[PDB]
Design a protein around this ligand. Structure first.
Ligand SMILES: Nc1ncnc2c1ncn2[C@H]1C[C@H](O)[C@@H](COP(=O)(O)OP(=O)(O)OP(=O)(O)O)O1
Ligand SMILES: [Ca+2]
Ligand SMILES: [Mg+2]
Length: 430
DNA sequence: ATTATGACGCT
DNA sequence: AGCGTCAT
């Protein structure tokens, strides 16, 4: 009853760029704008691998994880932009730099958590309290929410999508009770006003469009964001959760898309998030562990407490390359040449990071994969990172892995290496 | 031959 | 620490 917390204490948004690497390439090359197009890395094997797809191209069935040659079968006029190659490998610098553009604009409105290269969480609780006082109990006009969807509305007593959006928004606003400065629904609404402003700023200042979700926590904000992509934002209220979750496959919720989510489904014999409510907290803890059990018990009620971390910068800087199939590294000097290439890119990124961000990495992590294994990593080893020098780092990397070499001859490498990975970690201020 | 990343959990 | 899971 009155003591039952409802997880409505915060306003959290998740902002996710639409088709992000494609938009980065479309800004650069106007010929690609408003076209079926995709971003591809490498080319020789099956046309290259697609890693981003414009919404026009998605209409033909083109997806990421698809080979370009197969995508071209679905969409013959598909336009392609290639990821830059440097020192023999894909280089994602253009997209990392575009990410920084967006992250810095968002940071003007509130403290953000960088969740990926193209999305960030925002805790807007304080900002909402602020805007609420300047409003002075003045109603929120629909005009302040021109791209907002209210999930679950309209309901009850039509052809158009935009017409439906406004119908829902009007029902929402008509029911709002703006006299209450602590009404969670009002707080979410003001949150949505701020996110309209944030998203307008991003588009004005970068040319990039994005979607967003506004709710009371990170998981609901993330889920909300995807409900109306692209170029729209969605408010998921606490009240909307029972209907939303009643038909929501468990795998859709962030962290449940893998083995844990499959286990929830198998063990409990359920399909939808809402079905979790019928279990006690102790029951869920018994199957999934103390932390997961408590998390699930609250999450299926729309409640989650994970804070938006004040972290705008990545915690690690890494360089990785696969050597598939026949290209697997079978000689020592192959291994050393590629360790150097990776180390040279790593040094480049590390030196720029030190200048920009006043920090220095102190630990180097070296990872390889051997032909045979289908784990991502076969072996992970750390060593000290004392100097930003590629030759030193590549020599150090070689030292920590050289005994993985089974071949009695030391010119050769067996089994051949199908992956190298260098990662700089454990930053300190400098 | 679904690549190049990046965060967080377990023991 | 090294490994696994999940994610984009
Ligand atoms: N598995 C991956 N491998 C390599 N790059 C990826 C992968 N997934 C995503 N990316 C890159 C390319 C994406 O443009 C970018 C952001 O990913 P993501 O948000 O999932 O899709 P997207 O921004 O391209 O489309 P949208 O968000 O509109 O569905 O990160
Ligand atoms: Ca995105
Ligand atoms: Mg994303």
């Amino acid at each position: 009853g009155p003591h039952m917390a409802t997880g409505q204490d915060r306003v959290v948004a998740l902002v996710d760029m639409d088709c992000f690497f494609v938009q980065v390439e479309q800004r650069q090359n106007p010929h690609l704008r408003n076209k079926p197009c995709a971003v591809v890395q490498y080319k020789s094997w099956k046309g290259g691998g697609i890693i981003a797809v414009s919404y026009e191209a998605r209409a033909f069935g083109v997806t990421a994880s698809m080979w370009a040659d197969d995508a071209k079968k679905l969409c013959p006029d598909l336009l392609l932009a290639q990821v830059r190659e440097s020192r023999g490998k894909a280089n994602l610098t253009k997209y990392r730099e575009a990410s920084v553009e967006v992250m810095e604009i968002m940071s003007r409105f509130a403290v953000i958590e960088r969740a990926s290269i193209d999305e960030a969480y925002v805790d807007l609780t304080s900002a909402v309290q602020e805007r609420l006082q300047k409003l002075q109990g003045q109603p929120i006009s629909a005009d302040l929410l021109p791209s907002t969807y209210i999930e679950g509305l309209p309901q009850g007593p039509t052809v158009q999508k935009e017409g439906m959006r406004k119908q829902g928004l009007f029902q929402w606003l008509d029911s709002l009770q703006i006299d209450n400065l602590t009404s969670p629904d009002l707080q979410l609404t003001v949150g949505a006003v701020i996110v309209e402003e944030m998203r307008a700023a991003i588009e004005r200042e970068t040319g990039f469009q994005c979607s967003a979700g506004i709710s009371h926590n990170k998981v609901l904000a993330k889920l909300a964001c995807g409900l109306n992509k692209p170029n729209r934002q969605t408010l998921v209220s606490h009240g909307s959760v029972p209907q939303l979750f009643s038909q929501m496959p468990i795998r859709k919720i962030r962290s449940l898309g893998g083995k844990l989510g499959a286990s929830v489904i198998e063990i409990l014999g359920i399909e939808y998030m809402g079905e979790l409510t019928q279990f006690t907290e102790s029951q869920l803890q018994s199957h999934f562990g103390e932390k997961n059990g408590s998390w699930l018990y609250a999450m299926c009620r729309g409640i989650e407490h994970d804070p938006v971390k004040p972290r705008q910068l990545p915690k690690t800087i890494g360089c990785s390359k696969n050597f598939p199939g026949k290209t697997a590294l079978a000689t020592r000097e192959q291994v050393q040449w590629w360790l150097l290439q990776l180390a040279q890119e790593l040094e480049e990124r590390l030196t720029k990071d030190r200048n920009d961000n006043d920090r220095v990495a102190t630990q180097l992590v070296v990872s390889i994969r051997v032909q045979g294994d289908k784990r991502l990593s076969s072996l992970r080893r750390c060593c000290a990172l004392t100097r930003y020098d590629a030759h030193k780092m590549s020599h150090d990397a070689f030292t920590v892995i050289k005994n993985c070499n089974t071949s009695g001859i030391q010119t050769e490498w067996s089994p051949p290496l199908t992956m190298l990975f260098l990662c700089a970690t454990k930053f300190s201020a400098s």
